[model samples]
Target chain A: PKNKARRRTTTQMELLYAD
Target chain B: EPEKEEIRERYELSEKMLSACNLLKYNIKDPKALASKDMRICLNTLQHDWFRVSSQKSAVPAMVGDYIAAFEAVSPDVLRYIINMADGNGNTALHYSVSHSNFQIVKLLLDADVCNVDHQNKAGYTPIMLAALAAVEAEKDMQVVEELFSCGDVNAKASQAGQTALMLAVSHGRIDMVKGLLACGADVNIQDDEGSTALMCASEHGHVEIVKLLLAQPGCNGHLEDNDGSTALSIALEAGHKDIAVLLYAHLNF
Candidate 1:
């Protein structure tokens, strides 16, 4: 998604939380 | 941007730092050191040292606030030098301060106004999310939460797990935090990638109080499931939280 668009799971912490 | 949500949970940002950690792992100068017997001590030292310098009082003529601004003014290479010091954790000085509840250090960072509250690390979580996670007291934490809520991008999500702050708090049994989030307008029925709602998480965790609270929300709909097709009742049953299952059974009209 672009800066203005709502990102798909972009903010979801799964990436950060991934082991 | 003006449309950003100002208040955020601290865990939201913590997730970003964690993601940064994973990314940094590949370039760690001493990956073996991470597995050393003294690794715990080393991490403690890094965390303490980082926070002390960023905290309210330091040797700086003005304060950490001034130093942060000075640091931010530096080139990317210079900034990376500082950011690279913390083993494999992508935590910068800011990450350390917020995670350890170093209020002064956090203030110093925020005061600089040089960093973006919504800035995502390797993960999508932002500094504001990290800060909100640190607020131990719900009311006090709400301040940080509110700050993120007012300033963070409205559509910003957590790292992975497709969680929002509300989902995390509900799972963690941060009842007060959950309430605050709701009062501030968290979407009640927002399902995670797992298709679980905040209510489902609480119910499955056997956080009976939280489940009750969530059930009371005008917009709450407990039958929702995650991508795995598991409902809150299913999660509770899987976890063997019989009490939670009972609550869900009654709530689901079974």
Candidate 2:
């Protein structure tokens, strides 16, 4: 019920570490 | 950003600012603990009350000015309380969740918008600092760490010492965190009380990759001297890190 991932943003730092 | 006041003056809550916290007691019995604090019966008594139980069951008159807690809404007082409240050792829910690697709860707290992300615990550890380190050691998604830095006061310092998150990250010998910290705008020049820069700490600790990350930033100053008037090169030389000493020696020269 707590589906919050869709509402979250991927920040620039996270982008750099992406697989 | 920095909570200088004594907000978390220890523990103990009375449903006044206790319900949400009881929900975070490491899982299980939340239903029982939550229901006990309520002022409703799920019928007349309802599930108890959320926080401060207001008497008006229906719509309020235009004459009323202040609103108390309701089942569906959070009150201002509750916001103020939870923002800085701490458990026994002064770790707020943010600190507790981050340390335990409960990324979801960390997200929930972040979404609350009222939480001060940079609040340090009794041992002067920021939630962001904890999350950053945990992501490297535990197999957590870097997204959680990324979210924290985005929402956090990145340059925030520890309470017990003046060590910024960057300083601690460099000394901990993790290049992954150091790189992200720099990219996230952690101040590379921030120094501790002894005037120790991140570069100096890296040299003494012999974190070669960490030293490389620090020097890669054009703004980072390896030539800077500390309270002892020793540059990073000196610290590295005396500390017996030959490779790090050579690295700093070159940086200081050019």
Candidate 3:
């Protein structure tokens, strides 16, 4: 349940392509 | 002692300025000596302006109109002082305005002669780069981008990766922005740290439209290679973008 409820802390922009 | 009253006034002004901008996080050893009346007025005015700017769910034209009307009365020197102040994150008023896509606020701040349009944040992002990134994430007309370019240097490079605004626009599939930046004299062939041009970024990232836009430039060179000696065509093929590869292949006449 804990793993299921956990979500990504970063946005797509921040994760891959932020400057 | 007459000096005591003046010291107290300066202290109050500093505190007021710091408080107005919600800048308690500034770890100043002695804010009283540091926060002059001009500094205080800078923060206080922008704090009020920011409050008004941030209050709405979105930047409505009327709301921005009202905010500008209220903010215009602050003299240029005070406005310049406000633009120079930074938060703990080192984000200036210019940074925040661009992030919010508040074109009016950005233009107002740029109108001042002393405003540092290219001020880099702790993250080394200039206002123009941030505006380009904002265009990528959120959709807007080139208003914010145009305003920043018109006032600030369009070629300001990011400290991280050494990418210019044009490259950032291409990396994120902002084709319109790529075009807009090019129109505003953005150097198309400017390379990043890895020697990657905007054409390479667009091609590798599968931005065919952006690739097309970049190729149209007289100076756009699809054959330019990166640190690995990979051209835009090679990178496009490597990245599995067939369409982009085809386009670069034709552009390079290879």
Please write out the lDDT profile of model 2 over residues B64-183, one tens digit for every residue.
112222211444444444434554455665665566565655665565566688776666667776765555454464666777888878887665346666776666666777777888
Query: Whose TM-score is higher: candidate 1's or candidate 3's?
Result: 3
For candidate 2, the lDDT comes to 0.58
Q: What lDDT does the true structure give each of the candidates?
A: 0.55, 0.58, 0.63
Candidate that would win on TM-score: 3
Q: Label model 2 with its docking quality class.
A: incorrect
Worst 10 residues of 2 chain B by lDDT: B59-68
- Compared with the true structure, the alpha-carbon lDDT of candidate 3 equals 0.63
Ranking by lDDT: 3, 2, 1
Q: Name model 1 segments beyond 4 Å from true.
A: A1-19, B1-62, B68-94, B111-114, B128-142, B153-155, B249-254
* Model 1 lDDT per residue over B142-170, tens place: 56555545555423565555566676666
DockQ measured for candidate 1: 0.07
Query: Candidate 2 or 3, higher lDDT?
Result: 3
Q: Which CAPRI quality tier does the interface of model 3 achieve?
A: incorrect
Total clashes, candidate 1?
38
